């Protein structure tokens, strides 16, 4: 049922093999870039901490802080430029190799299907594409991140690295389950409606018989009995997916708690420094998470090898009216909006707790007081994890249940109005998709906006309180950091121009295959251009995350040295603003097209009021 790993790439020529080799080297280099970033970040933290401790000591009785921070700005910018180049080459070369091979495969498959099966020519080649393209570069980049992170961890601190080893299996498993849930989310949504979509298609295809025999009140009940099961499956999915991702968040925050309790123990015993702790922790944790994230790649490669089997065998042989739709679910919406506020407000709460536990180690104090404060802040990390688990689950569950109730109701009354009466394909799409997207204009929009406000608005407010000069500087790059998060999630998710050439294939010798070949030219060139365009977009938004470090901490060195701020405040502002922009991007990448959703709702309301 699957082809060979070597036989998968039999249409690659010398240029494609070169693209793969150089794209894999660039992937290794790109993946090695975040652990080196954490190494540099730890050294910078230690510079700041030592300066702060010495100033605290000599209070009653920062000279070189800016000079020392220029070098680290250079290191940050160098890693950022290297990552820019390497990410560009990786993404670009892997997309180009995949595109050239998929083009040759499409042409060969249509030549062979006629030298002698439409799904095998439309969707199976797309499965091969999804398998042999970006995902392989992702996989090598994530393997490099894992290995480099663990090398940096063991070289900087093996004791703390071992303590985080004890946890890394669960972290990689959480990341794997998370990424798999994200990958298969829409497929499961389409699969739940399968049994009711069959009834819908078979009734709408024989509508004359139905309204002639008067079986409207019975086909409605068949559809309803299947809609109940679709809704139950949707509720179960809303429970399990959200409980899994909430458990992942809880595990991340508990890892913070544990690693920082142990690391602060090692720092108070004099054996480690706080920058050393930061380096080890962030390196090992990000590596362990990257491993998990690299499992959709293996699933996709296996699916590509599965899809290539058949092919190669053949070849070889009003927003207020819309909201009023979902009005009876105001309890779910109240609970969900409350939970979305509490969920968004966890990024600034984390910024505060993190900056405080690190600022404990940037000024001198009694060892007993330092132990007490470190214990308190580790406990606060754990409490953050518990709260995030609960609120994430509740937000997801309430909004998903309201969305399921609304979808079932909309499908039901849409079918009832079609029966109390426009091709059958259009009607089945109105029932399968248009009814399932009206929730995107209500609950999804509400959740995304509430969470993003409670996150970035609160972050920016407390950042203006703690350090307004740095907040003003970082506000200029907030849009690019948010877009970086959006682009990164779109790149991980792997997210029409072939429909024109689907006609020449659906119709069907040499002339037909020549017409098909000529029809493929425009989408071929479009994909070859999109490869470069997306490579450069991704690489630039990735490098901006590295340049944010340089800018923020050079200006923070200036401010700390001139006494306008402390390193704890610089850390708080960095965390809050920068990673709240990143979280805003990551959350907004789950919001559906509000325009398409309003259009779907308009069509649904037309059909219902007809």
């Amino acid at each position: 049922p699957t082809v060979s790993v070597f036989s998968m790439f039999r249409y690659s020529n010398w240029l494609d093999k070169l693209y793969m080799v150089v794209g894999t080297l660039a992937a290794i280099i790109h993946g090695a870039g975040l652990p080196l970033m954490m190494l540099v970040f730890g050294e910078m933290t230690d510079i700041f901490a030592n300066a702060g401790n010495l100033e605290d000591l000599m209070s009653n009785i920062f000279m070189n802080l800016e000079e020392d921070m220029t070098r680290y700005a250079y290191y940050y910018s160098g890693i950022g430029a290297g990552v820019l180049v390497a990410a560009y080459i990786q993404v670009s070369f892997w997309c180009l190799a995949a595109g050239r091979q998929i083009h040759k495969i499409r042409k060969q498959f249509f030549h062979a299907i006629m030298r002698q099966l439409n799904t095998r020519l439309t969707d199976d080649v797309s499965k091969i594409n999804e398998g042999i393209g970006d995902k392989i570069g992702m996989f090598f980049q994530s393997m490099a991140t894992f290995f480099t992170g663990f090398i940096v961890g063991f070289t900087r601190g093996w004791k703390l690295t071992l303590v985080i080893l004890a946890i890394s299996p669960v972290l990689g498993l959480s990341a794997a389950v998370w990424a798999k849930i994200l990958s298969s989310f829409t497929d499961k949504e389409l699969l739940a409606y399968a049994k009711a979509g069959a009834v819908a298609e078979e009734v709408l295809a024989a509508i004359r018989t139905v309204i002639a025999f008067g079986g409207q009140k019975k086909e409605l009940e068949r559809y309803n009995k299947n809609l109940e099961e679709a809704k139950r499956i949707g509720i179960k999915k809303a429970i399990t997916a959200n409980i899994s991702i909430g458990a992942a968040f809880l595990l991340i925050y508990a890892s913070y708690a544990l690693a920082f309790w142990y690391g602060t123990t090692l720092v108070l015993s004099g054996e480690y420094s706080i920058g050393q702790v930061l380096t080890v922790f962030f390196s090992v944790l990000i590596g362990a998470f990257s491993v998990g994230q690299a499992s959709p790649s293996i699933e996709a490669f296996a699916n590509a090898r599965g899809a290539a089997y058949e092919i190669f065998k053949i070849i070889d042989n009003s927003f207020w009216r819309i909201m009023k739709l979902n009005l009876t679910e105001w309890p779910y919406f109240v609970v969900g909006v409350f939970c979305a506020i509490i969920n968004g407000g966890l990024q600034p709460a984390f910024a505060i707790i993190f900056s405080k536990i690190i600022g404990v180690f940037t000024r001198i104090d009694d060892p007993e007081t330092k132990r007490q404060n470190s214990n308190l802040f580790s406990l606060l990390f754990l409490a953050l994890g518990i709260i995030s688990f609960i609120t994430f689950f509740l937000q997801g569950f309430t909004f998903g249940k309201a969305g399921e109730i609304l979808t079932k109701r909309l499908r039901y009354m849409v079918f009832r109005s079609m029966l109390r009466q426009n091709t059958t394909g259009a009607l089945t799409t109105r029932l399968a998709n248009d009814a399932a997207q009206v929730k995107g204009a209500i609950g999804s929009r509400l959740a995304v906006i509430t969470q993003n406000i409670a996150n970035l608005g609160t972050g920016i407010i407390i950042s203006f309180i703690y350090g307004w000069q740095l907040t003003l500087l970082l506000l200029a790059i907030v849009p690019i950091i948010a877009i970086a998060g959006v682009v990164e999630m779109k790149m991980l998710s792997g997210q029409k121009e072939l429909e024109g050439s689907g006609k020449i294939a659906t119709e069907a010798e040499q002339k037909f295959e020549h017409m098909y070949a000529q029809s493929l030219q425009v989408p071929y060139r479009n994909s070859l251009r999109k490869a470069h365009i997306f490579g450069i977009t991704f690489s630039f938004t990735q490098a901006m995350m590295y340049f944010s470090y340089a800018g923020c901490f050079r200006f923070g060195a200036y401010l700390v040295a001139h006494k306008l701020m402390s390193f704890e405040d610089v850390l708080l502002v960095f965390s809050a603003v920068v990673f709240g922009a990143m979280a805003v991007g990551q959350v907004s990448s789950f919001a559906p097209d509000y325009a398409k959703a309003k259009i779907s709702a308009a069509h649904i309301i037309m059909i219902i009021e007809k």
Partner: antibody
Amino acid sequence: EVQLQESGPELVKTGASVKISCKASGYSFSNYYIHWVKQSHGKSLEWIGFISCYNGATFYNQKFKGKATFTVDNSSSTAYMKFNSLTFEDSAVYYCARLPIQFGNFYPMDYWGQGTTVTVSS
Amino acid sequence: QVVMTQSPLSLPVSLGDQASISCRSSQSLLHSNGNTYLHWYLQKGQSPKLLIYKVSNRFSGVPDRFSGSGSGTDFTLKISRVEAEDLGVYFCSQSTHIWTFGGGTKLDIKR
């Protein structure tokens, strides 16, 4: 074990210079200051200053500024104190002690060197 | 500069008996954070060893014979049973206002 091995006894000519060392072993060198303390015969100990074993930032007692100079070799984990224009009043025993950087003066000098006697004679 | 004064410059003791060494600062050693940073070291051509720190906390690996008390500008180090590995020079150290040390007290065998 934490150990601070100091160099050996030194007999110096008046007006010359001598550099004495404190080799640390058994702990993370760069998380501590090395303080230098002087003891003349029949007098109380006297703090000279300290140097940071992380970046080499020094602080000198006002009586000793210009008279002594602290340096640090982070590779060998040693601290040095050098005198200039030694006079007879510098005949004394010199100790090194370590202090955690994280706690500053909110902690004792827990480990000391064994002392280096310096006899300035012409 | 805080001046630290040790009352007995020499303390004749007897093996097995008790000993008490006093220290007095020219200014209160209580810090604004509620702690008093007074430490006691023993010196024998060896390195000084920390015995007591922060008035009364015994250092790691120090026998139970050594105990410390005192409040402000008046502190004491008591040795409950003077063994033979205790004859040396005990000196106090403050680190509240900053480093200054006490003059030292030599334990001598009484006869």
